[PDB]
Design a protein around this motif. Structure first.
Motif, PDB file in Angstrom:
ATOM      1  N   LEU A  24     -14.302  61.552  -7.467  1.00 55.13           N
ATOM      2  CA  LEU A  24     -14.710  60.167  -7.595  1.00 55.13           C
ATOM      3  C   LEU A  24     -14.364  59.724  -9.004  1.00 55.13           C
ATOM      4  CD1 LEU A  24     -17.261  58.327  -8.904  1.00 55.13           C
ATOM      5  CD2 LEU A  24     -16.274  57.595  -6.701  1.00 55.13           C
ATOM      6  N   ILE A  25     -13.641  58.614  -9.108  1.00 56.23           N
ATOM      7  CA  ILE A  25     -13.416  57.935 -10.378  1.00 56.23           C
ATOM      8  C   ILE A  25     -14.137  56.604 -10.297  1.00 56.23           C
ATOM      9  CG2 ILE A  25     -11.753  56.972 -11.977  1.00 56.23           C
ATOM     10  CD1 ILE A  25      -9.653  58.839 -10.731  1.00 56.23           C
ATOM     11  N   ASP A  26     -15.065  56.375 -11.211  1.00 60.75           N
ATOM     12  CA  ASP A  26     -15.727  55.084 -11.346  1.00 60.75           C
ATOM     13  C   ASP A  26     -14.975  54.322 -12.429  1.00 60.75           C
ATOM     14  OD1 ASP A  26     -17.305  52.899 -11.805  1.00 60.75           O
ATOM     15  OD2 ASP A  26     -19.183  54.003 -11.791  1.00 60.75           O
ATOM     16  N   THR A  27     -14.240  53.276 -12.045  1.00 59.51           N
ATOM     17  CA  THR A  27     -13.452  52.565 -13.050  1.00 59.51           C
ATOM     18  C   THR A  27     -14.301  51.694 -13.975  1.00 59.51           C
ATOM     19  OG1 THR A  27     -12.913  50.584 -11.759  1.00 59.51           O
ATOM     20  CG2 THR A  27     -11.500  52.538 -11.447  1.00 59.51           C
ATOM     21  N   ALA A  28     -15.606  51.547 -13.717  1.00 59.68           N
ATOM     22  CA  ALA A  28     -16.438  50.807 -14.661  1.00 59.68           C
ATOM     23  C   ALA A  28     -16.426  51.472 -16.030  1.00 59.68           C
ATOM     24  CB  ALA A  28     -17.871  50.698 -14.140  1.00 59.68           C
ATOM     25  N   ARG A 166      -5.484  55.866  -7.911  1.00 55.63           N
ATOM     26  CA  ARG A 166      -5.840  54.840  -8.885  1.00 55.63           C
ATOM     27  C   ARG A 166      -4.589  54.204  -9.485  1.00 55.63           C
ATOM     28  NH1 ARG A 166      -9.729  55.141 -14.200  1.00 55.63           N
ATOM     29  NH2 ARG A 166      -9.569  52.897 -14.678  1.00 55.63           N
ATOM     30  N   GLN A 167      -3.635  55.027  -9.921  1.00 52.90           N
ATOM     31  CA  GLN A 167      -2.437  54.488 -10.561  1.00 52.90           C
ATOM     32  C   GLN A 167      -1.671  53.577  -9.617  1.00 52.90           C
ATOM     33  OE1 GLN A 167      -1.722  58.656 -12.783  1.00 52.90           O
ATOM     34  NE2 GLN A 167       0.150  57.464 -12.441  1.00 52.90           N
ATOM     35  N   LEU A 168      -1.628  53.934  -8.333  1.00 50.80           N
ATOM     36  CA  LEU A 168      -0.851  53.184  -7.352  1.00 50.80           C
ATOM     37  C   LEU A 168      -1.494  51.848  -7.009  1.00 50.80           C
ATOM     38  CD1 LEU A 168       0.117  56.052  -4.878  1.00 50.80           C
ATOM     39  CD2 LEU A 168       1.657  54.816  -6.421  1.00 50.80           C
ATOM     40  N   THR A 169      -2.826  51.793  -6.952  1.00 48.44           N
ATOM     41  CA  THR A 169      -3.528  50.621  -6.430  1.00 48.44           C
ATOM     42  C   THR A 169      -4.140  49.740  -7.505  1.00 48.44           C
ATOM     43  OG1 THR A 169      -5.570  51.906  -6.167  1.00 48.44           O
ATOM     44  CG2 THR A 169      -4.070  51.801  -4.278  1.00 48.44           C
ATOM     45  N   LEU A 170      -4.612  50.336  -8.599  1.00 51.43           N
ATOM     46  CA  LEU A 170      -5.282  49.617  -9.670  1.00 51.43           C
ATOM     47  C   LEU A 170      -4.505  49.658 -10.969  1.00 51.43           C
ATOM     48  CD1 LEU A 170      -8.915  50.873  -9.016  1.00 51.43           C
ATOM     49  CD2 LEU A 170      -7.870  48.721  -8.294  1.00 51.43           C
ATOM     50  N   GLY A 171      -3.636  50.642 -11.148  1.00 50.86           N
ATOM     51  CA  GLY A 171      -2.820  50.785 -12.332  1.00 50.86           C
ATOM     52  C   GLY A 171      -1.428  50.216 -12.158  1.00 50.86           C
ATOM     53  N   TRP A 204     -19.014  46.280   1.276  1.00 49.87           N
ATOM     54  CA  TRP A 204     -18.033  46.751   0.310  1.00 49.87           C
ATOM     55  C   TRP A 204     -16.656  46.776   0.966  1.00 49.87           C
ATOM     56  CZ3 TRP A 204     -20.297  51.509  -2.767  1.00 49.87           C
ATOM     57  CH2 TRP A 204     -21.479  51.111  -3.405  1.00 49.87           C
ATOM     58  N   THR A 205     -15.629  46.431   0.200  1.00 44.77           N
ATOM     59  CA  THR A 205     -14.269  46.426   0.725  1.00 44.77           C
ATOM     60  C   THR A 205     -13.618  47.776   0.460  1.00 44.77           C
ATOM     61  OG1 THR A 205     -14.070  44.038   0.397  1.00 44.77           O
ATOM     62  CG2 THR A 205     -12.018  45.300   0.562  1.00 44.77           C
ATOM     63  N   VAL A 206     -12.909  48.293   1.461  1.00 42.18           N
ATOM     64  CA  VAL A 206     -12.284  49.608   1.380  1.00 42.18           C
ATOM     65  C   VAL A 206     -10.816  49.498   1.762  1.00 42.18           C
ATOM     66  CG1 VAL A 206     -12.284  51.979   2.237  1.00 42.18           C
ATOM     67  CG2 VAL A 206     -14.452  50.755   1.919  1.00 42.18           C
ATOM     68  N   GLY A 207      -9.953  50.123   0.972  1.00 42.68           N
ATOM     69  CA  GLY A 207      -8.606  50.427   1.410  1.00 42.68           C
ATOM     70  C   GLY A 207      -8.488  51.932   1.430  1.00 42.68           C
ATOM     71  N   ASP A 208      -8.071  52.526   2.542  1.00 40.65           N
ATOM     72  CA  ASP A 208      -8.086  53.978   2.615  1.00 40.65           C
ATOM     73  C   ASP A 208      -6.974  54.460   3.524  1.00 40.65           C
ATOM     74  OD1 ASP A 208      -9.537  53.347   5.195  1.00 40.65           O
ATOM     75  OD2 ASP A 208      -9.542  55.530   5.326  1.00 40.65           O
ATOM     76  N   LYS A 209      -6.716  55.757   3.436  1.00 40.98           N
ATOM     77  CA  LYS A 209      -5.909  56.452   4.428  1.00 40.98           C
ATOM     78  C   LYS A 209      -6.597  57.763   4.738  1.00 40.98           C
ATOM     79  CE  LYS A 209      -2.565  57.424   7.197  1.00 40.98           C
ATOM     80  NZ  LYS A 209      -3.588  57.776   8.206  1.00 40.98           N
ATOM     81  N   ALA A 210      -6.989  57.930   5.993  1.00 36.74           N
ATOM     82  CA  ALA A 210      -7.596  59.161   6.468  1.00 36.74           C
ATOM     83  C   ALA A 210      -6.521  60.055   7.080  1.00 36.74           C
ATOM     84  CB  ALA A 210      -8.707  58.852   7.475  1.00 36.74           C
ATOM     85  N   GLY A 211      -6.910  61.274   7.413  1.00 32.65           N
ATOM     86  CA  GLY A 211      -5.976  62.197   8.024  1.00 32.65           C
ATOM     87  C   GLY A 211      -6.682  63.440   8.499  1.00 32.65           C
ATOM     88  N   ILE A 224     -12.272  51.610  -3.346  1.00 32.05           N
ATOM     89  CA  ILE A 224     -13.452  50.896  -2.889  1.00 32.05           C
ATOM     90  C   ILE A 224     -13.737  49.794  -3.889  1.00 32.05           C
ATOM     91  CG2 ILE A 224     -15.885  51.088  -2.312  1.00 32.05           C
ATOM     92  CD1 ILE A 224     -15.208  54.253  -2.190  1.00 32.05           C
ATOM     93  N   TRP A 225     -13.931  48.575  -3.392  1.00 33.16           N
ATOM     94  CA  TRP A 225     -14.361  47.451  -4.215  1.00 33.16           C
ATOM     95  C   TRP A 225     -15.790  47.123  -3.812  1.00 33.16           C
ATOM     96  CZ3 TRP A 225      -9.505  48.126  -2.304  1.00 33.16           C
ATOM     97  CH2 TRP A 225      -8.438  48.027  -3.205  1.00 33.16           C
ATOM     98  N   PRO A 226     -16.788  47.701  -4.469  1.00 30.70           N
ATOM     99  CA  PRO A 226     -18.175  47.344  -4.171  1.00 30.70           C
ATOM    100  C   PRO A 226     -18.468  45.935  -4.651  1.00 30.70           C
ATOM    101  CG  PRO A 226     -17.996  49.413  -5.443  1.00 30.70           C
ATOM    102  CD  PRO A 226     -16.690  48.692  -5.553  1.00 30.70           C
ATOM    103  N   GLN A 227     -19.563  45.387  -4.149  1.00 30.53           N
ATOM    104  CA  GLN A 227     -20.162  44.245  -4.810  1.00 30.53           C
ATOM    105  C   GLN A 227     -20.898  44.726  -6.054  1.00 30.53           C
ATOM    106  OE1 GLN A 227     -18.363  41.938  -2.972  1.00 30.53           O
ATOM    107  NE2 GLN A 227     -20.181  40.656  -3.263  1.00 30.53           N
ATOM    108  N   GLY A 228     -20.896  43.896  -7.096  1.00 37.50           N
ATOM    109  CA  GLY A 228     -21.763  44.134  -8.236  1.00 37.50           C
ATOM    110  C   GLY A 228     -21.282  45.139  -9.263  1.00 37.50           C
ATOM    111  N   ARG A 229     -20.127  45.761  -9.064  1.00 40.81           N
ATOM    112  CA  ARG A 229     -19.642  46.760 -10.009  1.00 40.81           C
ATOM    113  C   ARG A 229     -18.139  46.912  -9.831  1.00 40.81           C
ATOM    114  NH1 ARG A 229     -22.511  52.265  -8.276  1.00 40.81           N
ATOM    115  NH2 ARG A 229     -21.112  53.213  -9.824  1.00 40.81           N
ATOM    116  N   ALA A 230     -17.518  47.584 -10.800  1.00 40.60           N
ATOM    117  CA  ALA A 230     -16.078  47.775 -10.791  1.00 40.60           C
ATOM    118  C   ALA A 230     -15.661  48.733  -9.670  1.00 40.60           C
ATOM    119  CB  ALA A 230     -15.633  48.331 -12.142  1.00 40.60           C
TER     120      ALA A 230
END
Length: 263
Positions: A24-28, A166-171, A204-211, A224-230
């Motif tokens: 888990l990386i919390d980008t906050a 993280r690098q692909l989606t937020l970086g 909360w909004t999620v973009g994911d790939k399961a397998g 994951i884009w939660p409400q109320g936090r980064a």
């Protein structure tokens, strides 16, 4: 906190009978919570993210690449290809193949992406080019899902995959248009509802790939884009001792709940 979460993940792993990997990386604040974060796990279909991202990278220098038709031939069909089988003896664009691989986990589509990148070694070369020294793709579908204990083929670590996602989606691994396209595809995944998403609030909004794969391997990687936090980046990898163990998407949901309640 981090320790309490790690203890809960350890209890989840023990009761599950398998081997659990979490990053888990919390980008906050850029904190990282890891559980077996440096052990290798078979990626199975979560590797489709790297292939789609690598094709998006190609499109930065060939701008109309996503609109290019690719022939789907009978020799391309594998067991699981709900989209590509409807286009055999026809064509799909690379955009359609990317969406099919990411949003329906279509394995023929993934093989077309792998081939477009020069093979598994080409997918791996893209990973290296963006600073991921851990990811390795060695095989095509469906063999990349054998998930044999002790086999490093087609594996990565939770830490490495969370950083790369993280690098692909937020970086900045991808250009802005390409990053938006990748995230749009991930947000549109139709086959991940039972995994990380099931352990998170519906608001909360999620973009994911399961397998999934053999050895009961059950995986999911998410932004994951939660409400109320980064935003958060979460990878949950899970594999089991029996070759034909059943998938446990609910175990991934439980790991996501531990993270979302505890951090």
């Amino acid at each position: 906190q981090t320790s309490a979460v790690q203890q809960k993940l350890a209890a989840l792993e023990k009761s599950s009978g398998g081997r659990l990997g979490v990053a888990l990386i919390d980008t906050a604040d850029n904190t990282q919570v890891l559980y077996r974060g440096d052990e290798r796990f078979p990626m199975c279909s979560t590797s489709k993210v790297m292939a789609a991202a690598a094709v998006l990278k190609q499109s930065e220098t060939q701008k109309q690449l996503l609109n290019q038709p690719v022939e789907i031939k009978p020799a391309d069909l594998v067991n699981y290809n709900p989209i590509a089988e409807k286009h055999v003896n026809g064509t799909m664009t690379l955009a359609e193949l990317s969406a099919a691989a990411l949003q329906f986990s279509d394995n023929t589509a993934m093989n077309k992406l792998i081939a477009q990148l020069g093979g598994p070694g080409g997918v791996t070369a893209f990973a290296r080019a963006i600073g991921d020294e851990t990811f390795r793709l060695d095989r095509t579908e469906p063999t990349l899902n054998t998930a044999i204990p002790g086999d490093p083929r087609d594996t990565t670590t939770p830490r490495a995959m969370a950083q790369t996602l993280r690098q692909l989606t937020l970086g900045h691994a991808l250009g802005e248009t390409q990053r938006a396209q990748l995230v749009t595809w991930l947000k549109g995944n139709t086959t991940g509802a039972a995994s990380i998403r099931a352990g998170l609030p519906t608001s909360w909004t999620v973009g994911d790939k399961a397998g999934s794969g053999d050895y009961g391997t059950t995986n999911d990687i998410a932004v994951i884009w939660p409400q109320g936090r980064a935003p958060l980046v979460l990878v949950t990898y899970f594999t089991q001792p029996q070759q034909n163990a059943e998938s446990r998407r609910d175990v991934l949901a439980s790991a996501a709940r531990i993270i979302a309640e505890g951090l």
